[PDB]
Design a protein around this motif. Structure first.
Motif, PDB file in Angstrom:
ATOM      1  N   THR A   1       0.420  -9.282  14.938  1.00  0.00           N
ATOM      2  CA  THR A   1      -0.181  -8.031  15.384  1.00  0.00           C
ATOM      3  C   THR A   1      -0.114  -7.897  16.901  1.00  0.00           C
ATOM      4  OG1 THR A   1      -1.637  -8.130  13.467  1.00  0.00           O
ATOM      5  CG2 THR A   1      -2.262  -6.627  15.205  1.00  0.00           C
TER       6      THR A   1
ATOM      7  N   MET B   1      -8.934  -6.481  14.648  1.00  0.00           N
ATOM      8  CA  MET B   1      -8.311  -6.813  13.380  1.00  0.00           C
ATOM      9  C   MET B   1      -9.404  -7.118  12.377  1.00  0.00           C
ATOM     10  SD  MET B   1      -5.746  -9.863  12.314  1.00  0.00           S
ATOM     11  CE  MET B   1      -4.577  -9.410  13.569  1.00  0.00           C
ATOM     12  N   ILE B   2      -9.475  -6.342  11.303  1.00  0.00           N
ATOM     13  CA  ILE B   2     -10.444  -6.582  10.241  1.00  0.00           C
ATOM     14  C   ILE B   2      -9.658  -6.883   8.976  1.00  0.00           C
ATOM     15  CG2 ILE B   2     -12.426  -5.775   9.026  1.00  0.00           C
ATOM     16  CD1 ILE B   2     -12.900  -3.794  11.278  1.00  0.00           C
TER      17      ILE B   2
ATOM     18  N   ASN C   1       1.628  -4.711  18.421  1.00  0.00           N
ATOM     19  CA  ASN C   1       0.954  -3.786  19.324  1.00  0.00           C
ATOM     20  C   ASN C   1       1.724  -3.620  20.624  1.00  0.00           C
ATOM     21  OD1 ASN C   1      -1.306  -3.149  17.689  1.00  0.00           O
ATOM     22  ND2 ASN C   1      -2.298  -5.062  18.288  1.00  0.00           N
TER      23      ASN C   1
ATOM     24  N   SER D   1      -5.898  -0.308  17.604  1.00  0.00           N
ATOM     25  CA  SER D   1      -5.025  -0.606  18.739  1.00  0.00           C
ATOM     26  C   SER D   1      -5.781  -0.797  20.051  1.00  0.00           C
ATOM     27  CB  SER D   1      -3.974   0.490  18.886  1.00  0.00           C
ATOM     28  OG  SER D   1      -3.116   0.516  17.764  1.00  0.00           O
TER      29      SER D   1
ATOM     30  N   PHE E   1     -16.801  -2.022   4.590  1.00  0.00           N
ATOM     31  CA  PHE E   1     -16.936  -3.474   4.556  1.00  0.00           C
ATOM     32  C   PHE E   1     -18.407  -3.820   4.714  1.00  0.00           C
ATOM     33  CE2 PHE E   1     -12.473  -3.379   6.396  1.00  0.00           C
ATOM     34  CZ  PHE E   1     -11.933  -3.396   5.137  1.00  0.00           C
TER      35      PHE E   1
ATOM     36  N   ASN F   1       1.743   7.330   6.809  1.00  0.00           N
ATOM     37  CA  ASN F   1       2.312   6.853   8.063  1.00  0.00           C
ATOM     38  C   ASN F   1       3.621   7.550   8.397  1.00  0.00           C
ATOM     39  OD1 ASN F   1       2.487   3.461   9.483  1.00  0.00           O
ATOM     40  ND2 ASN F   1       2.407   5.487  10.435  1.00  0.00           N
TER      41      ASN F   1
ATOM     42  N   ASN G   1       0.856  -1.184   0.000  1.00  0.00           N
ATOM     43  CA  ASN G   1       0.000   0.000   0.000  1.00  0.00           C
ATOM     44  C   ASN G   1       0.892   1.234   0.000  1.00  0.00           C
ATOM     45  OD1 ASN G   1      -3.170   0.648   1.736  1.00  0.00           O
ATOM     46  ND2 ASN G   1      -2.219   1.627  -0.039  1.00  0.00           N
TER      47      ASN G   1
ATOM     48  N   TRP H   1      -6.672  -4.265   8.384  1.00  0.00           N
ATOM     49  CA  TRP H   1      -6.761  -2.979   9.064  1.00  0.00           C
ATOM     50  C   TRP H   1      -6.782  -3.234  10.563  1.00  0.00           C
ATOM     51  CZ3 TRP H   1      -8.527  -3.797   4.300  1.00  0.00           C
ATOM     52  CH2 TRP H   1      -8.322  -2.808   3.337  1.00  0.00           C
ATOM     53  N   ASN H   2      -5.719  -2.828  11.248  1.00  0.00           N
ATOM     54  CA  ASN H   2      -5.560  -3.090  12.669  1.00  0.00           C
ATOM     55  C   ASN H   2      -5.918  -1.848  13.469  1.00  0.00           C
ATOM     56  OD1 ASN H   2      -2.772  -4.654  11.411  1.00  0.00           O
ATOM     57  ND2 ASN H   2      -4.377  -5.839  12.420  1.00  0.00           N
TER      58      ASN H   2
ATOM     59  N   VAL I   1      -4.949   3.455  13.908  1.00  0.00           N
ATOM     60  CA  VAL I   1      -5.339   2.536  12.845  1.00  0.00           C
ATOM     61  C   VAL I   1      -4.091   2.185  12.049  1.00  0.00           C
ATOM     62  CG1 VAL I   1      -6.695   2.208  10.764  1.00  0.00           C
ATOM     63  CG2 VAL I   1      -7.690   3.339  12.716  1.00  0.00           C
ATOM     64  N   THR I   2      -3.806   0.894  11.934  1.00  0.00           N
ATOM     65  CA  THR I   2      -2.635   0.380  11.243  1.00  0.00           C
ATOM     66  C   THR I   2      -3.086  -0.530  10.107  1.00  0.00           C
ATOM     67  OG1 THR I   2      -1.373   0.483  13.307  1.00  0.00           O
ATOM     68  CG2 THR I   2      -0.453  -0.867  11.559  1.00  0.00           C
ATOM     69  N   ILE I   3      -2.444  -0.395   8.951  1.00  0.00           N
ATOM     70  CA  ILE I   3      -2.720  -1.238   7.794  1.00  0.00           C
ATOM     71  C   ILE I   3      -1.517  -2.133   7.560  1.00  0.00           C
ATOM     72  CG2 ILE I   3      -3.265  -1.305   5.349  1.00  0.00           C
ATOM     73  CD1 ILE I   3      -4.460   1.471   5.654  1.00  0.00           C
ATOM     74  N   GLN I   4      -1.674  -3.432   7.805  1.00  0.00           N
ATOM     75  CA  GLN I   4      -0.661  -4.406   7.424  1.00  0.00           C
ATOM     76  C   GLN I   4      -1.102  -5.109   6.148  1.00  0.00           C
ATOM     77  OE1 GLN I   4       0.111  -7.408  10.379  1.00  0.00           O
ATOM     78  NE2 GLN I   4      -1.966  -8.249  10.367  1.00  0.00           N
TER      79      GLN I   4
ATOM     80  N   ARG J   1       3.838   0.157  21.831  1.00  0.00           N
ATOM     81  CA  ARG J   1       3.625   0.891  23.070  1.00  0.00           C
ATOM     82  C   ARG J   1       4.817   0.816  24.013  1.00  0.00           C
ATOM     83  NH1 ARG J   1      -0.054  -3.524  23.724  1.00  0.00           N
ATOM     84  NH2 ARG J   1      -1.713  -2.181  22.885  1.00  0.00           N
TER      85      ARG J   1
ATOM     86  N   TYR K   1      -0.670   4.268   2.236  1.00  0.00           N
ATOM     87  CA  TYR K   1      -0.480   4.140   3.672  1.00  0.00           C
ATOM     88  C   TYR K   1       0.951   4.463   4.065  1.00  0.00           C
ATOM     89  CZ  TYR K   1      -0.079   2.086   8.287  1.00  0.00           C
ATOM     90  OH  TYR K   1       0.173   1.881   9.620  1.00  0.00           O
TER      91      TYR K   1
END
Lengths: 349, 358, 148, 110, 148, 115
Positions: free
Chosen positions: D43, E94-95, D47, E112, C124, C81, C74, E109-110, E143-146, D51, C77
């Motif tokens: 993840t 996590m989606i 995470n 936290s 979604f 970021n 991506n 899409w993560n 919001v994090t995108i992996q 932090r 992103y």
């Protein structure tokens, strides 16, 4: 060793690179026969990094190991190690090799590369240059007398000195900008300005040093820049003729001649008559319109780009229909890179 | 020798020196620098600060009636505005080996802009100025800071627009230094604070006390219609660099800030278009190159560099196939771009014309 | 007879064929809007009747782009970021109406110093046959129209 | 006496981070060893390491210079290792070292 | 010939196949939206003409999820009922856009530290053939995108 | 001369005008026969400016050169230079000439125009 079902901890220092390959870059890392560090298997396949450090679990420094390690860290799928006296045997046997890279190797890879080009396997060689520094009083026709005068090879002088201090043969730096360009921009775009990360050249090249090595046999410098760092700088083969100059248009016609050869072998045992000459002509035409559409040919109509002919009085004879031979002659116009950008300034508006 | 984790005390240290950051004034001082470790004897090394000089090079070098002045000339460089400051140690003058290999080593390093060899010997600089004279007319963007001997150009670089001569030797508490190490400092100070389009000719020289020859107006009146650029002494101000002309007597390239504006704009356009090399030579690429130059020339105009009032009076960029090229030139793999600019000239004469009639 | 080389001179241009040059790379987008040139208004009235109307200072454009989500890396992103409290790689945006081959510009809208301010996730929905579309909005200082 | 593990706070940072990652991944034991689980584990470590970085533990300026988490099938594993029921994760960090020597260097020349 | 292993590399991804990992459990949801990355804008103008445009500080995302009402135990009521004036179990959301089998992530899409701020009841109507859908809204910090 | 693959710099002062022509204006820049500055080709075609300064790379001042240079800087497509004793031969042969311009020329262009 795993014994109990919990979570394990260790601190053995390992590395692992991901795979982001392209199908049009399957090299042949030829290494010298005068080498006892390698496994005595004469030909072996390495599909990713996590299989290459099973055969070779400890970091070496030899020219076959800094060539593969600089391959896999830029993507890179499967790739081969073959002895320098066996590369004609392996090109003829695995059928997907698109590159021959001399990983610190000469004097017989140069010979056996000229073997497979006359047999017409549609290969593109990547050679090396001098390992110690070219002076400047060099008289370039004395340096490139060694190299073949075939349009299927390029040379790439300045050797590499990757971060562990070891030497990288510059056939591996130049093959590392082909993984990241066939993945990104396609096989028709020149492999030059793509940045290969984690290597630095041993020497330095001024602009006036490269200018005498540009025309002729085209030594294809590796140069560092502020910005796009340590790119390869020059995209010319070992022949300055007006159609087989420029590395990308040669590999653009390797992959055209091979994607039409693999798409039309599925039409053998058909009758060699006029319905077959049609579904040849609409199978070639459908492929090149997928290729013209993604910016690989020149001209802004499909009549500007390609033609194809196959038939009775076009390209064959009745002497050749009756012995089977189908001849399919295609002609197609490719693009050229903009090599020189002349800025001419003035004072008046 | 620090092993106890406390706080250590030393009592006879020297005060440290600050360094600035600049990209338009990066000089190459060719003088008698004495290395400590002898691998950097015939190569060019980068000296990012004065602390880098004291580690790589010998900075004391005790004298014997001869006096080492190469380490003194760099301290006056960083006091007047520092820089990345490339050095080339060249011991004696008559070794025509390393002087013949000098212009090929300058091109290998990307970022030299000024030359300015700071050496008090006269025949030493003539061997350096003659070896560098062939590289000034090759469109590479270098700018030589020569030094006059008795009031004239050193004749290795006669009338090229890339040369600025500076006449009076400057005395340090008393050894006399050629002023090129100090003027290379005040270029980086002026460009950082005002830009390359500003004339570097009202800067008060830090460090030094007095010049070797106090120059009158009447001998500057026969020198300033050449590029001599006298270091003058004013009683209220001190030592002020006074003059901003080059060796070229043309109306176009008469002044230093007009010349170094074009050298800096050509250098930054060249660094911006090198990603656009080995692109497909098509009309889509020619517009991507035209916009990258037009975005650069617009942000020079809006910060005061170009002499315009409309931004169509300041500059223009032209590229095309009927314009600036022919079809035979695309086929041999080149694109041709016409860029023009309009710079502003400094006010160097002020006439007062008093009266008492009203 | 209209002889289509005359269509390339005097007929207008549609909006479905465009190339977006994003810094030094070409990125395929689906939509692109908001490349406006807006000024403010200065006004001045006196008691005699003179109204003085003047253009003010032009404000910043807000450009919104949208493209689909692809299985690779991506790139949008990775550019939103890399924000550290002031520090963003500004880029030059070029949105050029192109011919059908994609090789020559008809008219272009240039954008000087753009940086991302938002990036929306796709919506979604388990009952929808749609493509995952991210929508990035940019903020710049100048919009330039080059015609060639 | 190694350059890596010379100091107490560098050593006990790695011992405490390995202890808290281990307590976080034990709910993910006896899960199906698939690519969906490998991303749920990546993840949960990412995470945790974020932090630590934003409270000053890790020596970075970008959060790609502080840490990395890697898991995959071509990366860090082979297919023979999934079949024997294990996942292999590569986690790296970058800690900051304390200032234990202060040299003053006085003078009276100015 | 497009050879569907190439569709898994270079074609875009639809939005109807997604797995929502909610803490350490998978919960089936119908919709999911609002996973945005939004920044503020700093501006500074002087009298000479320099406009300085800068990204501000990013604000909090507001994620809304919706699923149907099932006859068993309500897991989303049990997480919004456990609020005691500050104290909420934060969870990792996590989606992930998934393949059709459900076993490998295409892009994710993560989110936290999410905690619930609202939970809407379904709309009861005697003249409607619909499913009872609760809609929970969450508030997080990042919001994090992996992508993998 | 271009040698290495980089970016080149020069300061040779050149000019170049774009082309914004119309098809109904194809002139005939007739010039005098008493002129040795011109190329001895009796009829020649100039499709744009970047081709006209290949045949004539240095700026002249003669009446055929300030006529073409003031043509190309206002658009102007293709256009012709013909000797004043050959304009009847060139009108009859190229079929798209819509104008005859006497670029500092009389006493036989007036004659051969009436032809």
């Amino acid at each position: 060793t795993t014994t109990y079902p919990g979570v394990y901890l260790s601190e053995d220092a390992v590395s692992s690179f991901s795979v982001n390959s392209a199908a049009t870059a399957v090299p042949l890392f030829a290494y010298d026969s005068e080498n006892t560090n390698t496994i005595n298997k004469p030909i072996q396949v390495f599909r990713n990094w996590a299989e290459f450090t099973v055969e070779y679990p400890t970091p070496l420094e030899d020219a076959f190991y800094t060539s593969l390690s600089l391959w896999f860290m830029h993507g890179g799928g499967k790739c081969y190690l073959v002895n320098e006296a066996n590369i004609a045997d392996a090109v003829a046997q695995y059928d997907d090799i698109t590159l021959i890279v001399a990983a610190g190797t000469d004097t017989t890879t140069y010979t056996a590369f000229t073997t497979v080009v006359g047999q017409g396997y549609r290969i593109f060689g990547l050679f090396d240059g001098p390992k110690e520094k070219i002076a400047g009083t060099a008289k370039p026709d004395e340096v490139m007398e060694e190299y073949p005068t075939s349009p299927f090879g390029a040379v790439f002088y300045p050797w590499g000195t990757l971060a562990s201090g070891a030497a990288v043969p510059p056939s591996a730096i130049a093959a590392a900008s082909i993984t990241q360009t066939d993945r990104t921009r396609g096989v028709w775009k020149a492999p030059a300005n793509q940045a290969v990360n984690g290597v630095t050249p041993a020497f330095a090249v001024s602009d006036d040093f490269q200018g005498k090595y540009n025309q002729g046999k085209a030594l294809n410098m590796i140069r560092t820049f502020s910005g796009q760092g340590t790119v390869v700088w020059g995209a010319r083969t070992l022949e300055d003729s007006d159609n087989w100059r420029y590395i990308p248009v040669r590999r653009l016609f390797n992959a055209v001649e091979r994607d039409i050869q693999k798409s039309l072998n599925k039409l053998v045992f058909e009758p060699n008559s006029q319905p077959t000459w049609q579904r040849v002509k609409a199978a070639v035409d459908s492929y090149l319109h997928s290729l013209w559409q993604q910016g690989a040919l020149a001209g802004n109509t499909p009549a500007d780009a390609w033609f194809v002919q196959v038939g009775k009085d076009l390209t064959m004879t009745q002497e050749e229909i009756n012995q089977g031979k189908m001849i399919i002659k295609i002609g197609l116009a490719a693009v050229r890179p903009a090599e020189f950008i002349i800025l001419q300034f003035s004072q008046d508006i | 020798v620090t092993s106890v984790p406390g706080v250590y005390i030393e009592e006879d240290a020297s005060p440290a020196m600050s360094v600035s950051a600049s990209a338009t004034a990066v000089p190459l001082f060719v003088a008698r620098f004495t290395p400590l470790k002898p691998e950097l004897a015939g190569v060019i090394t980068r000296i990012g600060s004065w602390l880098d000089y004291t580690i790589l090079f010998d900075s004391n070098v005790p004298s014997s009636v001869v006096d080492p002045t190469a380490s003194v000339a760099l301290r006056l460089y960083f006091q007047n505005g520092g820089g990345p400051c490339y050095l080339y140690p060249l011991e004696k003058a008559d070794d025509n080996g390393p002087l013949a290999a000098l212009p090929d080593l300058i091109d290998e390093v990307g970022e030299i802009t000024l030359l300015a060899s700071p050496d008090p010997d006269e025949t030493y600089r003539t061997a350096v100025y003659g070896a560098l004279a062939a590289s000034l007319d090759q469109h590479k963007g270098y700018f030589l800071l020569a030094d006059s001997v008795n009031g004239d150009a050193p004749s290795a670089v006669g009338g090229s627009a890339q040369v600025a001569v500076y006449y009076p030797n400057v005395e340090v508490p008393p050894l006399s230094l050629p002023p090129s190490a100090l003027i290379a400092g005040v270029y980086g100070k002026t460009d950082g604070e005002r830009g390359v389009w500003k004339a570097p000719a009202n800067v008060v020289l830090n460090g030094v006390s007095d010049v070797s020859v106090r120059v009158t107006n009447e001998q500057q009146a026969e020198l300033n219609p050449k590029g001599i650029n006298v270091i003058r002494h004013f009683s209220d101000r001190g030592l002020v660099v006074w003059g901003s002309r080059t060796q070229k007597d043309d109306d176009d390239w008469r002044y230093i800030p007009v010349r170094r504006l074009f050298d800096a704009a050509e250098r930054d356009i060249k660094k911006a278009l090198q990603p656009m090399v080995f692109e497909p030579n098509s009309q889509l690429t020619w517009k991507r190159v035209q916009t990258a130059i037009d975005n650069y020339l617009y942000r020079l105009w809006q910060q005061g560099a170009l002499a315009g009032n409309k931004a169509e009076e300041a500059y223009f960029v032209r590229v095309g196939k009927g314009i600036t090229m022919t079809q035979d030139e695309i086929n041999q793999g080149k694109m041709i771009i016409q860029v023009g600019m309009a710079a502003v000239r400094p006010a160097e004469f002020i006439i007062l014309k008093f009266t008492q009639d009203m | 007879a209209i002889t289509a080389d005359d269509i390339a001179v005097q007929y207008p241009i549609p909006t479905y064929r465009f190339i977006v040059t994003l810094g030094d790379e070409q990125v395929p987008f689906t939509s692109a809007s908001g490349l406006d040139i807006n000024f403010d208004t200065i006004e001045y009235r006196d008691g005699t009747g003179n109204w003085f109307k003047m253009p003010g200072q032009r404000q910043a454009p807000n450009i919104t782009l949208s493209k689909g989500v692809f299985p690779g890396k991506n790139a949008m992103y990775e550019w939103i970021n890399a924000i550290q409290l002031n520090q963003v790689e500004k880029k030059d945006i070029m949105i050029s109406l192109t011919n059908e081959a994609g090789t020559e510009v008809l008219v272009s809208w240039n954008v000087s110093n753009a940086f991302p301010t938002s990036l929306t996730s796709p919506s979604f929905d388990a009952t929808s046959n749609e493509i995952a579309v991210q929508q990035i909005t940019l903020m710049a200082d100048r919009v330039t129209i080059q015609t060639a």
